[PDB]
Design an enzyme around this catalytic site. Structure first.
Site, PDB file in Angstrom:
ATOM      1  N   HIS A  42       0.806  -1.217   0.000  1.00  0.00           N
ATOM      2  CA  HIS A  42       0.000   0.000   0.000  1.00  0.00           C
ATOM      3  C   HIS A  42       0.841   1.270   0.000  1.00  0.00           C
ATOM      4  CE1 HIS A  42       0.441   0.040   4.530  1.00  0.00           C
ATOM      5  NE2 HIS A  42       0.452   1.342   4.293  1.00  0.00           N
ATOM      6  N   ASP A  91      -6.873  -3.438  -2.830  1.00  0.00           N
ATOM      7  CA  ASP A  91      -6.787  -2.061  -2.340  1.00  0.00           C
ATOM      8  C   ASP A  91      -8.021  -1.624  -1.555  1.00  0.00           C
ATOM      9  OD1 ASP A  91      -8.541  -1.961  -4.441  1.00  0.00           O
ATOM     10  OD2 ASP A  91      -7.577  -0.311  -5.501  1.00  0.00           O
ATOM     11  N   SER A 191       4.292   1.649   8.673  1.00  0.00           N
ATOM     12  CA  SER A 191       3.908   0.809   7.537  1.00  0.00           C
ATOM     13  C   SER A 191       5.114   0.300   6.761  1.00  0.00           C
ATOM     14  CB  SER A 191       3.004   1.592   6.573  1.00  0.00           C
ATOM     15  OG  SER A 191       1.689   1.714   7.067  1.00  0.00           O
ATOM     16  N   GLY A 192       5.073  -0.984   6.426  1.00  0.00           N
ATOM     17  CA  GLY A 192       6.112  -1.608   5.645  1.00  0.00           C
ATOM     18  C   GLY A 192       7.285  -2.137   6.446  1.00  0.00           C
TER      19      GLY A 192
HETATM   20  C1  LIG Z   1       1.411   2.924   7.708  1.00  0.00           C
HETATM   21  O1  LIG Z   1       2.428   3.494   8.527  1.00  0.00           O
HETATM   22  C2  LIG Z   1       1.263   3.978   6.619  1.00  0.00           C
HETATM   23  N1  LIG Z   1       1.224   3.815   5.183  1.00  0.00           N
HETATM   24  C3  LIG Z   1       1.120   5.008   4.463  1.00  0.00           C
HETATM   25  C4  LIG Z   1       1.052   5.139   3.078  1.00  0.00           C
HETATM   26  C5  LIG Z   1       0.918   6.401   2.519  1.00  0.00           C
HETATM   27  C6  LIG Z   1       0.916   7.531   3.315  1.00  0.00           C
HETATM   28  C7  LIG Z   1       0.978   7.417   4.693  1.00  0.00           C
HETATM   29  C8  LIG Z   1       1.086   6.150   5.259  1.00  0.00           C
HETATM   30  S1  LIG Z   1       1.186   5.768   6.968  1.00  0.00           S
HETATM   31  C9  LIG Z   1       0.166   2.723   8.576  1.00  0.00           C
HETATM   32  C10 LIG Z   1       0.415   1.786   9.757  1.00  0.00           C
HETATM   33  C11 LIG Z   1      -0.687   1.838  10.810  1.00  0.00           C
HETATM   34  C12 LIG Z   1      -0.567   0.753  11.875  1.00  0.00           C
HETATM   35  N2  LIG Z   1      -1.737   0.980  12.735  1.00  0.00           N
HETATM   36  C13 LIG Z   1      -1.750   0.250  13.992  1.00  0.00           C
HETATM   37  N3  LIG Z   1      -0.871  -0.706  14.216  1.00  0.00           N
HETATM   38  N4  LIG Z   1      -2.674   0.570  14.872  1.00  0.00           N
HETATM   39  N5  LIG Z   1      -0.977   2.236   7.809  1.00  0.00           N
HETATM   40  C14 LIG Z   1      -2.055   2.989   7.592  1.00  0.00           C
HETATM   41  O2  LIG Z   1      -2.156   4.145   7.993  1.00  0.00           O
HETATM   42  C15 LIG Z   1      -3.206   2.333   6.828  1.00  0.00           C
HETATM   43  N6  LIG Z   1      -4.428   3.019   7.212  1.00  0.00           N
HETATM   44  C16 LIG Z   1      -4.944   2.824   8.427  1.00  0.00           C
HETATM   45  O3  LIG Z   1      -4.435   2.068   9.251  1.00  0.00           O
HETATM   46  C17 LIG Z   1      -6.218   3.595   8.782  1.00  0.00           C
HETATM   47  C18 LIG Z   1      -5.876   4.703   9.784  1.00  0.00           C
HETATM   48  C19 LIG Z   1      -7.172   5.247  10.386  1.00  0.00           C
HETATM   49  C20 LIG Z   1      -7.934   6.276   9.551  1.00  0.00           C
HETATM   50  S2  LIG Z   1      -9.272   6.481  10.755  1.00  0.00           S
HETATM   51  C21 LIG Z   1      -8.804   5.352  12.109  1.00  0.00           C
HETATM   52  N7  LIG Z   1      -7.572   4.713  11.728  1.00  0.00           N
HETATM   53  N8  LIG Z   1      -7.194   2.694   9.363  1.00  0.00           N
HETATM   54  C22 LIG Z   1      -8.493   2.717   9.046  1.00  0.00           C
HETATM   55  O4  LIG Z   1      -8.966   3.514   8.238  1.00  0.00           O
HETATM   56  C23 LIG Z   1      -9.354   1.692   9.748  1.00  0.00           C
HETATM   57  C24 LIG Z   1     -10.498   1.189   8.859  1.00  0.00           C
HETATM   58  C25 LIG Z   1     -10.032   0.393   7.655  1.00  0.00           C
HETATM   59  C26 LIG Z   1     -10.741   0.428   6.463  1.00  0.00           C
HETATM   60  C27 LIG Z   1     -10.318  -0.302   5.364  1.00  0.00           C
HETATM   61  C28 LIG Z   1      -9.184  -1.079   5.444  1.00  0.00           C
HETATM   62  C29 LIG Z   1      -8.465  -1.114   6.617  1.00  0.00           C
HETATM   63  C30 LIG Z   1      -8.888  -0.387   7.717  1.00  0.00           C
HETATM   64  C31 LIG Z   1      -2.966   2.320   5.306  1.00  0.00           C
HETATM   65  C32 LIG Z   1      -2.732   3.720   4.760  1.00  0.00           C
HETATM   66  C33 LIG Z   1      -4.112   1.636   4.570  1.00  0.00           C
END
Ligand SMILES: *[C@@](O)(c1nc2ccccc2s1)[C@H](CCCNC(=N)N)NC(=O)[C@@H](NC(=O)[C@H](Cc1cscn1)NC(=O)CCc1ccccc1)C(C)C
Ligand SMILES: *SC[C@H](NC(=O)CC[C@H](N)C(=O)O)C(=O)NCC(=O)O
Ligand SMILES: [Mg+2]
Length: 241
Positions: A42, A91, A191-192
């Site tokens: 991602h 995705d 992430s990653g």
């Molecule tokens: C990772 O560090 C990141 N990847 C990217 C890529 C591009 C720009 C920025 C970033 S930051 C993080 C790691 C998070 C680990 N979390 C925990 N261990 N608790 N990954 C993400 O941020 C992914 N998105 C989410 O985790 C979101 C954050 C959020 C928005 S509102 C509450 N939390 N999670 C959700 O939206 C939860 C609902 C959901 C829907 C659909 C699929 C999964 C979860 C990543 C960007 C997808």
């Protein structure tokens, strides 16, 4: 990392920081061989503002400790020549959230730069086992990232419990690791990066890839990670590693 502490310099010599042109650190990765990294698919998805899927847009820093000291002794800078996202990546659910990144030139092994061990396809990381998560991500949900690499100790959670905590979202490629009480977790910017597990002779094996979570470190909302043993053959077929 929420609820963690400063790592020692050189303590996690497989941890890599991935910077996108003009944007600084975006994602973590893990060194698995002289030429290859593991990361999250991602992180490498195009958007209307930036072609994150393009390997020329990235720089990998190996042996990095402090994000403000990217030229320090021992730090190695590398470009990427290829990004291989898993062909089954979803995705919408973030199923199969794993990528392989090919270094443009090989890493030089040193006291600061060393590969993590990969688990065999039949290895099971058991419920309750202690696991380490590392990264430069946020130290609070919605907070600010760490300059110094952070480490945190979490635990594998039973897969049935995981599914029940996050209904209709946990596939067999995913694993919950953390605490039901919250407190310690990865977070945005981790992430990653790799999960590091101490195995029977003290050598460290990669137990997962930081993927997603609902918030960070919330009660009954553990971090969700992409499993590794399931992809041993895919890695071998694509990299020779
Ligand atoms: C990772 O560090 C990141 N990847 C990217 C890529 C591009 C720009 C920025 C970033 S930051 C993080 C790691 C998070 C680990 N979390 C925990 N261990 N608790 N990954 C993400 O941020 C992914 N998105 C989410 O985790 C979101 C954050 C959020 C928005 S509102 C509450 N939390 N999670 C959700 O939206 C939860 C609902 C959901 C829907 C659909 C699929 C999964 C979860 C990543 C960007 C997808
Ligand atoms: S399994 C990947 C790592 N092994 C090595 O780096 C071996 C190279 C040595 N220089 C040697 O064999 O002589 C490894 O073990 N990583 C995990 C760890 O805990 O170090
Ligand atoms: Mg040093």
């Amino acid at each position: 990392v929420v609820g963690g502490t400063d790592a020692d310099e050189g303590e996690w010599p497989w941890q890599v920081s991935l910077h996108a042109l003009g944007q600084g650190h975006i994602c973590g990765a893990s060194l698995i061989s002289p030429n290859w990294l593991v990361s999250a698919a991602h992180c490498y998805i195009d958007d209307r503002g930036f072609r994150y899927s393009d390997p020329t847009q990235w720089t990998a820093f190996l042996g990095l400790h402090d994000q403000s000291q990217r030229s320090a002794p021992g730090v190695q800078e590398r470009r990427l020549k290829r990004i291989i996202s898993h062909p089954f990546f979803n995705d919408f659910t973030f199923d199969y959230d794993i990528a392989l990144l090919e270094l443009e030139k090989p890493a030089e092994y040193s006291s600061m730069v060393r590969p993590i061990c990969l688990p065999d396809a039949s290895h099971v990381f058991p419920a309750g086992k202690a696991i380490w998560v590392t990264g430069w991500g946020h130290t609070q949900y919605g907070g600010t990232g760490a300059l110094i690499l952070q480490k945190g100790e979490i635990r594998v959670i039973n897969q049935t419990t995981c599914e029940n905590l996050l209904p209709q979202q946990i596939t067999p490629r995913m694993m919950c690791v953390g605490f039901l009480s919250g407190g310690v977790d990865s977070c945005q910017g981790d992430s990653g990066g790799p999960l590091s597990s101490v195995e029977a002779d003290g050598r460290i094996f990669q137990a997962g890839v930081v993927s997603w979570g609902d918030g960070c470190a919330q009660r009954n909302k553990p971090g969700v990670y992409t499993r590794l043993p399931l992809f041993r053959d895919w890695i071998k077929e694509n990299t020779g590693v």
